[PDB]
Every structure is written in C-alpha cells, then in structure tokens.
C-alpha cells in the first residue's frame, strides 16, 4: 500500500498550534538564563560525590533552569488542543509526570554534538556532563541521558515532530493517577496519528525511515530516565539545606 494520506485541515491546524506554541515557550536565545541564580563551578575534576553534595554549586542555578522550564511546559501543555479539555486533576496528573521527560525532549535543541553539552551561551550557560554532577546527580543518568540526546539528535527531526513528540508525550494515557485516560489517549490518538501523517508525507527519506517507531521509542527511553532522576532527586532531597536550592515548583513536582 505504502498509503499517504494528505494532512487534513484539522492536523494541519493541529500542527501550527503546536509550532507557535513551541515558538511561544521557548526562547531559543535562552535570554531569561541570566534572571537564574548564577551558575557556580567548584572544582570537582574528581567527580568526588561528597564534595558535589556538600556544595551543590550548580544546583540553584539549574533548579531554577529546570523550574523556569517546567514553567513554559505548563504554558505549550495548556496549548495543546484539547489539553484544555481535560479535568484540571488529570492536566496537573499529566504536567507533573511528563514535566522532567519534556524537559529532555526540549532540550535536545539546546543540545550539541559538537563538544555534547547543552550550550545556551557563553561558558557561563554551556552545561557538561561535570555541571550536572555539581547539581548533586550521578554519571546513572548523566551518561544515558547523554546517550538519548546524540540518539535524538541523529533522528534529525522536523520542528513539527519535535513538538508533536513533545505533545504526545505529555498528553500520555498511562500516567499513574490519570482519571479519564480514554480521553487522554483519544487526545494522545489524534496527536500521534497527525504525526504518523506527516512524517509519511512530509520526511524526505532515507531519515523517514520506520521515524515513527523510532521516536515512540525514544517516549519509552524517557521513562526509564524519568525514573531514574525520580532516584537521584530522593538522594538529593536527603541533603541538608537542599529545599533552599531548589524552587517551590520543583519541590512539588519532584517532591
Ligand atoms: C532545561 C532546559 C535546558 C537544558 C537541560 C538540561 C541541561 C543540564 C542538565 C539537565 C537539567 C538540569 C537538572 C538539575 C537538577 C534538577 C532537579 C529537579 C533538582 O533534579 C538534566 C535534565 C535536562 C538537562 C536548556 C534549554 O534547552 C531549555 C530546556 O528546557
């Protein structure tokens, strides 16, 4: 068959929301990070964990990155048709679950192979491996979140998949404490089949290539990687004066 259907008005409607949603909530020229605690680098060319978790020098300064962040993936969420549609019980169920995977995702743009850091500026706004380990988490995440950023980034995807990925992933029906999960997944369905659309209409090959099972894929890395920060923040909530370096946002949506 190797049937591809046109977009239909709707996915193609469906499409621009996201995109201006997307152009809305982040800020390529990373502008705002200049607002956050300063990032503050000790030395640690050790990796020492009892150094990084008596300092956490890194972690005011990307707590307010991440908060800032889950901030504006509340705004693209609230854009995503038919988010609105949804109880504010099962929204809130969603925004806090996906929060740190779409942060991930998002990323990826700031992310680059070049030197694989997410360079956002100057020195000053370039975040390494050794930046992430002075916020108080270990190379068990560091390392494969590394490893899902150059995967992501090979996958070459359009900004419109970027963002359909990004929706789809939030707007997941197998969330724990999701009330309505049929509309959730009827809202999942209608964004998932817009992309599935699009890719095969849309991506030139030989990137097109089984894209689709590729990035659903990526959905699933995202778990296990939100599982695993889920561990390291545990840890790191257990250090003394840790509360202060984060943000009130962050304490309830990791807490
Ligand atoms: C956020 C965004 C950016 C980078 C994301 C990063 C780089 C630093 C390390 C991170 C974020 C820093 C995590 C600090 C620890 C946070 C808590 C909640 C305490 O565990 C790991 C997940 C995503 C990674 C910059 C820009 O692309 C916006 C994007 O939303």
Known sequence: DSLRPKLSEEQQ??????????????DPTYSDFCQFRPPVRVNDGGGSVTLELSQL????????????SIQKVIGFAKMIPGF??????????????????????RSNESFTMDD?????????????????????????????????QVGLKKLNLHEEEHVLLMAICIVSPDRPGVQDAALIEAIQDRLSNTLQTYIRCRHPPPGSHLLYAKMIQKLADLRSLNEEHSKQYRCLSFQPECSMKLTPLVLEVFG
């Open 57 to 68: 020098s890194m972690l005011p300064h990307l707590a307010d990155l991440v908060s800032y």
């Open 116 to 148: 694989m850091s997410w360079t956002c500026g100057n020195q000053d706004y370039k975040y390494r491996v050794s930046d992430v380990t002075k916020a108080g988490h270990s190379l068990e995440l560091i390392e494969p979140l590394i490893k899902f």
């Open 84 to 105: 609105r549609d949804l109880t504010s019980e099962d929204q809130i169920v969603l925004l806090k679950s996906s929060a740190i995977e779409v942060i991930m995702l």
């Open 13 to 26: 409607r469906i499409i621009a929301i996201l995109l201006d949603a997307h152009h809305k909530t982040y």
